[PDB]
Design a binder for this molecule. Structure first.
Ligand SMILES: Nc1ncnc2c1ncn2[C@@H]1O[C@H](COP(=O)(O)OP(=O)(O)O)[C@@H](O)[C@H]1O
Ligand SMILES: Nc1ncnc2c1ncn2[C@@H]1O[C@H](COP(=O)(O)OP(=O)(O)O)[C@@H](O)[C@H]1O
Ligand SMILES: Nc1ncnc2c1ncn2[C@@H]1O[C@H](COP(=O)(O)OP(=O)(O)O)[C@@H](O)[C@H]1O
Ligand SMILES: [Mg+2]
Lengths: 445, 145, 86, 27, 438, 433, 111, 60, 121
């Protein structure tokens, strides 16, 4: 968080309340049409009524495609799931590519569970059965309640409980002076140790003595837990916590991703629907961002047709900087973005344009502000000129070397000389390519 | 229900004069592993048994005899209307088959196969006449006098 | 024999469920419900030598202490006691 | 800090048995 | 609140929309047009429902966006949940855990359901009073008594040790409506007829009550157990197979296990124990299968346990994967002879407008007639899917400006914001050097 | 019973002299091929030759698989018949040669006599004897017997929760203990016990039954390679940790050969050499063909029937080597080629009528002639597949028989491969790729 | 060289451990005083009177080769010193010594 | 940063294993500790006896 | 190394184990670390057995019974071994060559371990 990454300045889409894109806001400069389209997509995601919708961000490299996707993620917030993914990740040594894609799809669909946990804390001061003056059957003693006195820091309360708890109290070996908690939703007694006030400095027990509970005896709170469908799927496919031989085998054997079946996923969907109907949970459909989609092969693209046509799928955002490239997995088949035309028919294309020199200068200034770097006007203009040639990424990457060089020289700002020296020290792709071409004999291969 | 066609114990390694420590070490390892893991394998008991031996389904008893099907319908009607039934057969083995069929259908019954001791006959009669839970009383036509 | 009877009934408040537990003999009732009195807070012992809160307990003299110098003084006093009383 | 030395080992081995531990006294 | 299932591509398709004579209506149950293809799909659906002919293959072939998957989903919705319907993509058979033939076998066997119907004795009633007497110390025989009540009956049952243990584990109390199966002794609590005593603490908020069951106590109810052939194969392959039903990880099932299961299921069918419910396997984009998979399909359809196979492809004369051979639909001619082909013709203007109207109705989007005309023109010029996407895009744009009906201006706005394949390719040609590899 | 593609094939339709009747046992033509298959059937029944390979060669739809299944039907259910597709050797668990070898052993069957020792009765005494053995008392309707059993049997009895009064079944050979139920005599003690009652066994406590077991060499190999008969912890561990198939060694197969030879010498086993059928042989690669050379040269191998519809085609796994059936010439030298021919229109009509009768469909003579004409173009397979849709159309319209109008309507609804190819060619720019 | 005992069992006695075993051939009969390990071996593999068995003395390896009153009882000496020759391949040695219970890999691959 | 007890075990007395006492010493100190059930179980599992130099984590 | 003539654990738990080993050159009495008692019990070491004990590691291998006891029973499944010839205490200075790969593979997986996870490994 404290370290500054490449998209650390993107705090969202700089959109007006009417959806029009401001020239420079929220860390984004230019790309007004793409930003407006991404805002419409954000509204689509927030509406939560659409499934399997796909958006393709198409444009030259360094045009804000990843920046736009991260701005969408910022607009949605941490509540909405956002699962980033590169196309190269589908090639795994454990599971098939379609399984990786399906798992990322289920990772993008989130679930928020709200429950109230009501507990009774305290140190057991009293443990008294409530006998009845008329014993049932004539002989012996019959009890109708068990009074348990619970003491905390700021109170003491007595609880008239069911007689059946007498067995739980004995199983937990609860005596006076022990700290216990009773859960209303289950009616079970759990002994969380003995109070520390009865412990002497000469005792050696570790987990036996616990502090007297603070607060009130009756504690109730609302628990909000955020889970994804993939979490439930994985927890059910390879369960952890059993005491049978299969759980022991799972603990012993090396963990391995498996091809989760449609049966388990359907069961998870049924359970999620039951929770939603009961009011326990609220569905939070999020976004799956697949960067470098062109690295997917023809099998992945073909599977994506069925994946997107589903009614449970999230909203998928693609991104590709390729032109009329050859689809991977095929022999000499060319498509406009490296993507077969069948999948292009299922997506909405957002075009990102190149940056004018003024926009490049603005982005450089924003990046300098983010990195805590003071840059003079002449140095900024020179770095923008450097960015007109070469690329924008090269110019924004000269800021920290130039700042270091200035600090070594003993200056608190980047001057033009520092940028010139850094430009001399480091080469861009085009200059290196010129050098390589001029000396192709001396290089290898 | 699927059972392997063949079942064999693992191959055994035999030498005339083996290292006298190998076998006790393997025995101790097996004993410790069994003592730690066999209690954890109890839940899988039904799966192992079903894959180890297959018995005929009790339902197939009725499917192999049309008389049993007709009797099943008749007994269902008789119980629904709230009657008590005496089943008479010439063969004691038929009584054994009826015992199986009545148990499978859940019909409580008593048996008088002529092989019962004389003193027990009256006790069985009195129990059937006194206990209303007994739905059926299988009897042998030639028996009982 | 000596038994514990678990009983659940339907009784009018239009109906409510109640559970009762019946012990055949008073011995079982005492065993399950000893009615133990609340425990007593131990006295926070103090080192007789340095008056700091006690942290240790010399097994030979049963005198609590909180410093190595206090332990040495306690053992010297015990040696003197052995020499005198014998 | 608490590695043994040959000198300490030899001293302990050659020295006589330690005196018996005194019985606890409630004092 | 939004359920896990939301508006998807084929959410508007509720069936094939045929009459008794299998004649397609112009617009019914979401389907529009495709009259010949829908009639053929209806005939195939009747063949599936009859369930007498094994290993029938149908190929739905047509141009992209002609409703092949729409027709498949309509068949699935018209079949109903009783008949299995396994829909997979061609890419899904390429697995690192099993062979392609094994994956195809599992897909085939997931499309056949085995149903066992048996009658069991069932006790359902309201618990009035339960009493359990147990020894105070040491191992002993628990003795108990249970009283159960319906609207017309009340019986007191003497309980055995195992039934006592079952009731104790289920924590059955008075007023609980319980179900008891006499054979297995399983007890299922289904509600409470009334509240617990109020004087008790730490009991929680009492939920709603359940009316007491009527009729006799011990009834006779029909229990139906339905599993697929794949589930039987998995649970019979190994001891840990039941977990493989959820984790996958089945490996390759031995052919001996499948032969034994086929024999046992045939025996059950002859003995009247079980009935076989053949279903459908739908392989979308079957052109991703290689020659080995197609060769397996050729012979796997010759079994009496094979389901109806339905394929969809939008390929012309194309190279078969794994070979250098050009074949129709990317499918070898040997397999094309074993199947009937259903062609889907392109949609007209009125069919496109009706599809757009049905999509708007499904998405709860209100649109003007001029907007419908413009959107139909865009769909004819670009594609049907692009217009469908513009429907909700323009709905969102209209809602942003505090409107109620999607106008032509909103459609133009979303047409400008979101590009189709043609305009994107044009703009990429305009900047061909800026894009990386051409 | 569902009707499959070969449900009408019941035999080769040969006379006593070996000649092929024109229409018999669901076969209409291929008289020469049927006579050759009859000779192959006699060869299989001789049980003298090993590793004799046969190739069924011809265009698709010429009944090669029908002839293989007819050979299977002629042999009977006792003689093993293992059908495998060439695409099935590409397993992700074992090598292709291992798959081929396993399918070879599956074709050899063994009928072996076995005696089962059974302890069956109601438990009257279950007394442990300190590892703790068990002393058990069993009663039937004929007597009572007391037995001393191994501690493993006691553990099995404990796992089954067997207590005094329960009817149990013990198999002494496998040590398999099954608790069947509480004895029927105790079914009146309670009103709700959560127990399944079973009558008292009416035989003896100890029974010996002799049965005939049908097993294959592959079953023995699997049982001795992934053992599960010891009922020890190590067997469970091996099953759970190593569930995949393994490449069984030649040493294990030699040991199994020795054991089976010993069994046959003892007179308690009978060998049934059996048949292996590979349908799509062209799907095998050059490595599989090379292995099959040596495998067929073995004196243990069964009779293998190969099929192929390929012409002069490139062998899989080679770059550009082309061979007459997709099969390298070396393997073709080791096979007997049975040639299947294309069917005349009369034979096509006969096959259509047979399929209609098999599917329970009444078809008029005019409809039969029209469908035979439809089969003259397109293929016979396409013409046969129009029978059920036409029957469904006739049933919808209230007709109990197929008329020509129903066949025309169905053919209009469904295209064939050639018509679809024409449509694709006319509209190549609109379809993908 | 190994010592092999092949004969017909006459009487087997085990008492709470001590035991006796009586074996006979067609030419001689003998009573043996059994040790604990041989008693355990004879208990694990059920041996009763009339069985024809062979015992490897050093290992307790008892294999029942039939019953006699079906294989004829052995003729000559009860206890025989035999020369057993094994030809073991280098691969077999490697697999046996590769791991504990590693000889199993000679039959199931898994090397 | 963790608090530990470090000394040489002098005597381990366990009564009957519900309660017992442990005596630890240094070159400059010696004290006796009252043990609980889990501490006694942990000491018996590690087979700690006299003359053993051990460290005990106070927290765990 | 030698035949075991006495095996007496000395109780304070066990403070030490006194063992008596016999060879052709005499008898030696040894005091064993109490941890070796577990190894001796696992190896089933009794009087009359020929064993060796490693001084540095405490490893015990019971390499059969002494052949002087071969006639104690007429039929036992025992391996009878001659009494060792040299002294009970044997010292040898050796030079053994190992490669870095041997040390690498020795530390790749754990050895021994009485835990369930270790045994299953
Ligand atoms: N319009 C913009 N406003 C602000 N920063 C931008 C803009 N466009 C690109 N950047 C930044 O410039 C860098 C180039 O990355 P990016 O444009 O995301 O490449 P691509 O679009 O090919 O993924 C990133 O740090 C990105 O955040
Ligand atoms: N006849 C139709 N009736 C209703 N919706 C249709 C029809 N044809 C296509 N659609 C819809 O238009 C989209 C494209 O059709 P689809 O079936 O996916 O084409 P493909 O043949 O490529 O599968 C889907 O959302 C589908 O539901
Ligand atoms: N001579 C025949 N008589 C009757 N039916 C036949 C005959 N030949 C083929 N068939 C049937 O026609 C179909 C095609 O035959 P098949 O054996 O699949 O040809 P292939 O040689 O391509 O395998 C099958 O349903 C088969 O049962
Ligand atoms: Mg589609």
């Amino acid at each position: 968080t404290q370290r500054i990454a490449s998209h650390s300045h993107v705090k969202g889409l700089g959109l007006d309340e009417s959806g029009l894109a401001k020239q420079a806001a929220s860390g984004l400069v230019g790309q007004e049409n793409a930003r407006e389209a991404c805002g419409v997509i954000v509204e689509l995601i927030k509406s939560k009524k659409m499934a399997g919708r796909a958006v393709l961000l198409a444009g030259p490299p360094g045009t804000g495609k990843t920046a736009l996707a991260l701005a969408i993620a910022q607009e949605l917030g941490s509540k909405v799931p956002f699962c980033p993914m590169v196309g190269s990740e589908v090639y795994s040594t454990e599971i098939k590519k379609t399984e990786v894609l399906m798992e990322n799809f289920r990772r993008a669909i989130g679930l928020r569970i709200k429950e109230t946990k009501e507990v009774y804390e305290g140190e057991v001061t009293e443990l008294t059965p409530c006998e009845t003056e008329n014993p049932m059957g004539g002989y012996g003693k019959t009890i109708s309640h068990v009074i348990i006195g619970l003491k905390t820091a700021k109170g003491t309360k007595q609880l008239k409980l069911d007689p059946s708890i007498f067995e739980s109290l004995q199983k937990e070996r609860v005596e006076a002076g022990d700290v216990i908690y009773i859960e209303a939703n289950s009616g079970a007694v759990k002994r969380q140790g003995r109070c520390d006030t009865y412990a002497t400095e000469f005792d050696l027990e570790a987990e036996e003595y616990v502090p007297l509970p603070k607060g009130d005896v009756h504690k109730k709170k609302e628990i909000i837990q955020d889970v994804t469908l993939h979490d439930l799927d994985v927890a059910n496919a390879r369960p952890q916590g059993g005491q049978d031989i299969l759980s022991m085998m799972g603990q012993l054997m090396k963990p391995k991703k498996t091809e989760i079946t449609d049966k388990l996923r359907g069961e998870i969907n049924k359970v999620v629907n039951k929770y939603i109907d009961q009011g326990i949970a609220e569905l939070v459909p999020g976004v799956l961002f697949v960067d470098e989609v062109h690295m997917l092969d023809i099998e992945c693209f073909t599977y994506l047709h069925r994946a997107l046509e589903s009614s449970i799928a999230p909203i998928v955002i693609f991104a590709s900087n390729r032109g009329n490239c050859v689809i991977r997995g095929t022999e000499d088949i060319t498509s406009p973005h490296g993507i077969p035309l069948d999948l292009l028919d299922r997506v909405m294309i957002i075009r990102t344009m190149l940056y004018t020199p003024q926009e490049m200068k603005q982005i450089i200034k924003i990046r300098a502000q983010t990195e805590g770097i003071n840059i003079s006007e002449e140095a900024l203009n020179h770095l923008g000129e450097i960015g007109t040639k070469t690329t924008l990424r090269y110019s924004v990457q000269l800021l920290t070397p130039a700042n270091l060089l200035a600090k070594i020289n003993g200056k608190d700002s980047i001057e033009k000389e520092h940028v010139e020296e850094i430009s001399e020290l480091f080469y861009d792709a085009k200059s290196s390519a010129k050098i390589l071409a001029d000396q192709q004999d001396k290089y290898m291969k | 229900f699927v059972m392997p066609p063949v079942e064999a114990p693992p191959p055994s390694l035999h030498a005339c004069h083996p290292p006298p420590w190998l076998a006790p070490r393997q025995a101790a390892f097996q004993e410790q592993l069994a003592s730690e893991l066999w209690p954890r394998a109890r839940p899988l008991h039904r799966i192992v048994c079903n894959m180890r031996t297959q018995f005929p389904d009790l339902r197939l008893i009725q499917y192999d005899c049309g008389k049993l099907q007709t009797l099943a319908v008749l007994l269902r009607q008789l119980k629904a209307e709230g009657h008590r039934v005496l089943i008479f057969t010439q063969m004691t083995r038929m009584l054994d088959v009826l015992e199986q069929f009545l148990t499978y259908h859940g019909h409580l019954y008593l048996r008088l196969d002529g092989s019962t001791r004389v003193e027990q006959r009256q006790a069985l009669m009195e129990r059937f006449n006194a206990d209303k839970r007994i739905f059926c009383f299988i009897l042998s036509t030639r028996s009982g006098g | 024999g000596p038994i514990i009877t678990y009983h659940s009934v339907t009784v009018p408040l239009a109906r409510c469920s109640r559970t009762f537990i019946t012990f055949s003999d008073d011995a079982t009732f005492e065993e399950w419900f000893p009615q133990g009195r609340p425990p007593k807070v131990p006295v926070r012992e103090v080192c007789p030598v340095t008056h700091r809160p006690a942290l240790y307990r010399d097994p030979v003299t049963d005198i609590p202490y909180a410093t190595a110098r206090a332990f040495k003084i306690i053992r010297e006093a015990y040696k003197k006691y052995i020499t005198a009383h014998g | 800090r608490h590695r043994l030395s040959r000198r300490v080992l030899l001293e302990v081995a050659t020295a006589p048995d330690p005196p018996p531990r005194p019985k606890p006294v409630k004092m | 609140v939004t359920r896990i299932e939301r508006i998807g591509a084929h959410s508007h398709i509720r069936g094939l929309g045929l009459d008794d004579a299998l004649e397609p209506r112009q617009a019914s149950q979401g389907m529009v047009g495709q009259l010949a293809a829908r009639r053929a799909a209806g005939v195939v659906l009747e063949m599936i429902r009859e369930g007498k002919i094994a290993g029938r293959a149908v190929l739905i072939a047509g141009q992209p966006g002609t409703g092949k998957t729409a027709i498949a989903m309509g068949m699935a919705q018209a079949l109903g949940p009783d008949t299995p319907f396994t829909a997979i993509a061609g890419s899904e058979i390429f697995s690192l855990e099993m062979s392609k033939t094994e994956a195809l076998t599992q897909a085939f066997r997931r499309s056949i359901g085995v149903r066992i119907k048996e009658e069991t004795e069932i006790i359902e009633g309201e618990v009035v009073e339960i009493q359990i007497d147990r020894p105070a110390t040491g191992t002993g025989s628990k003795v108990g008594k249970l009283t159960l009540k319906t609207t017309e009956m009340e019986t007191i049952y003497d309980l055995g040790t195992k039934m006592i243990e079952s009731l104790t584990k289920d924590k059955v109390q008075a007023g609980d409506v319980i179900t008891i199966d006499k054979a297995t002794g399983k007890i299922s609590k289904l509600g409470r007829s009334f509240t617990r005593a109020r004087d008790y603490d730490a009991m929680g908020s009492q939920t709603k009550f359940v009316q007491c069951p009527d009729g006799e106590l011990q009834k006779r109810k029909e229990v139906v157990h339905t599993v697929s052939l794949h589930e039987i194969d998995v649970i019979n392959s190994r001891t840990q197979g039941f977990l493989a039903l959820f984790s996958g990880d089945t490996g390759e099932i031995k052919s001996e296990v499948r032969e034994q299961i086929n024999a046992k299921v045939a025996e059950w069918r002859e003995e009247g124990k079980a009935e076989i419910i053949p279903g459908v396997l739908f392989i979308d984009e079957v052109h991703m299968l290689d020659i080995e998979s197609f060769s397996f399909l050729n012979r796997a359809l010759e079994s009496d346990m094979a389901p109806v196979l339905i394929m969809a492809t939008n390929r012309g004369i194309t190279r078969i994967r794994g070979t250098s051979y050009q074949s129709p639909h990317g499918i070898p001619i040997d397999l094309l002879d074993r199947l009937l082909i259903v062609s889907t013709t392109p949609y007209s203007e009125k069919d496109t407008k009706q599809i757009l109207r049905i999509r708007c109705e499904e998405e709860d989007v209100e649109m003007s007639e001029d907007a419908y005309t413009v959107l139909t023109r865009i769909g004819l010029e670009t594609s049907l899917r692009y217009a469908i996407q513009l429907i909700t895009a323009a709905s969102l744009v209209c809602r942003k400006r505090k409107g109620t009906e999607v106008q032509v201006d909103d459609i133009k706005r979303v047409y400008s914001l979101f590009l189709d394949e043609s305009r994107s390719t044009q703009y990429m040609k305009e900047y061909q050097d800026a894009f990386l590899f051409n």
